[PDB]
């Protein structure tokens, strides 16, 4: 069905088919030099140029080389600029370019290629759907939203556009509105709709509005492999890690860290309070849409295993203290931060992104009553100078119905069963 040869390339179909046969049979070195010869003999051949690119692409996979792949990405573009490029070949070449650009993390370059693709094929629905993803991958939910509105103005039942539109709506806190789009799109079954994100957010959406069928969808997500359990709904996981909502210090093995936190708790408190008191902008409001109501702000010392040097100027002894514990300072899937919460605050039930961390909470200023945290089926409270430990990949929920402010210190650690290699290699979150 693919029509990849223009009239010129048909005049040399035998040479092109010989080169491609070498590639399909795995003789990459041989194929590279065959298509190189063809590109040399026929500088204007689109098919010879595409074969060169596919061979560079294959050679990048064999060597696991980003640099080689960057070369393939440029050759795929050369294909699109040659004379009389068949439409099927033009689409294949630029689509692969954008896909490989995404693989490298060149999200801005992929977006440019995707904008050119949609401009070349205005009627290809799937290219617009992929353009929307391109916007989402750069954090441009406004342009992404327009793309999917366009799409389902033309094609109202495209399941892919439905779940992506509902995902965008929920991100904008259009909870009730996003439900039908997320719900219908999963039941569609279209390619790209069987994604844990959409199961995660549909259930959460339904939970926030009281729609008691949310857990029916979580169990479904569990059946599809997206959630380890109905309660533990993180999506960036290492399978087999001990899963329990509450931990003791002994169970984590990080007993010296827990001791250092509790023994030095007044020093940690006083530095955090001193930062509050200066009243600069260092405590930032929570900005993940997790609050039903109230006031919640956080002052972060470490994130993604990276020390915030300016923050540590405001809590210099606390930061010096923590350097002794790479299990937290090097936890590239966690943070170290102070968290202040004021009266009249309720945090929605929610889950963290990964099962590769545990969270330690050290009480610093805890009103005698009104402050609660539930994780899974158990509700606990903080105490000044004491550490609580839970797995925030389990659903958890917080209340602040006290008469004054509540301050804690949050120290993330690698899940103890993660190996040193896993701790060095896992992508940061």
């Amino acid at each position: 069905k693919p029509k990849l040869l223009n009239k010129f390339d048909k005049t040399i179909k035998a040479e092109l088919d010989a080169a491609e046969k070498l590639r399909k049979r795995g003789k990459i070195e041989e194929a590279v030099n065959a298509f190189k010869e063809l590109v040399r003999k026929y500088p204007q051949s689109p098919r010879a140029r595409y074969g060169k690119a596919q061979c560079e692409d294959d050679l990048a996979e064999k060597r696991r080389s980003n640099e080689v792949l960057r070369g393939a990405i440029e050759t795929y573009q050369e294909v699109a600029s040659l004379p009389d490029v068949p439409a099927d070949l033009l689409k294949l070449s630029l689509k692969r370019r954008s896909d490989r650009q995404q693989f490298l993390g060149h999200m801005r370059g992929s977006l440019l290629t995707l904008q050119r693709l949609v401009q070349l094929f205005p009627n290809d629905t799937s290219l617009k759907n992929d353009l929307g993803v391109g916007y989402l991958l750069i954090g441009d939910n406004d342009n992404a939203k327009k793309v999917y509105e366009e799409v389902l103005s033309v094609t109202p039942n495209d399941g892919f556009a439905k779940v992506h539109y509902g995902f965008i709506l929920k991100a904008q806190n259009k909870i009730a509105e996003s439900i039908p789009y997320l719900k219908e799109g999963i039941e569609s079954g279209d390619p790209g709709t069987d994604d844990g994100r959409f199961y995660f957010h549909l259930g959460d959406a339904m939970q926030r509005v009281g729609n008691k069928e949310a857990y029916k969808w979580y169990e479904l997500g569990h059946k599809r492999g997206h959630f380890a359990s109905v309660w533990q709904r993180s999506l960036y996981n290492v399978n087999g890690l001990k899963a329990q909502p509450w931990w003791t210090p002994k169970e984590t093995g990080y007993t010296e860290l827990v001791k250092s936190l509790e023994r030095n708790w007044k020093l940690i408190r006083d530095e955090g309070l001193a930062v509050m008191d200066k009243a600069k902008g260092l405590f930032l409001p929570e900005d993940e849409n997790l609050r039903e109501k109230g006031d919640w702000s956080q002052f972060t010392l470490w994130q993604q295993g990276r020390r915030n040097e300016n923050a540590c100027k405001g809590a210099p002894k606390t930061c010096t203290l923590l350097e002794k514990f790479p299990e937290t300072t090097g936890c590239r899937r966690g943070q170290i931060k102070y968290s202040i919460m004021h009266p009249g605050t309720h945090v929605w039930p929610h889950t963290g992104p990964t099962n590769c961390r545990l969270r330690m909470h050290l009480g610093l200023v805890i009103p005698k009553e009104g402050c609660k945290i539930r994780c899974a089926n158990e509700t606990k409270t903080w105490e000044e100078g004491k550490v609580l430990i839970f797995d925030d990949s389990f659903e958890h929920e917080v209340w602040q119905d006290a008469s004054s402010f509540r301050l804690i210190f949050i120290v993330d650690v690698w899940h103890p069963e993660l190996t040193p290699q896993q701790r060095r290699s896992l992508p940061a979150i």
Binding site: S65, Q102, F103, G105, N289, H350
Partner: peptide
Amino acid sequence: GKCKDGLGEYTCTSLEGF
């Protein structure tokens, strides 16, 4: 944007090829 306490971003990791 980053996924700190939740799963708000379309993707929570920044891939870098091989």
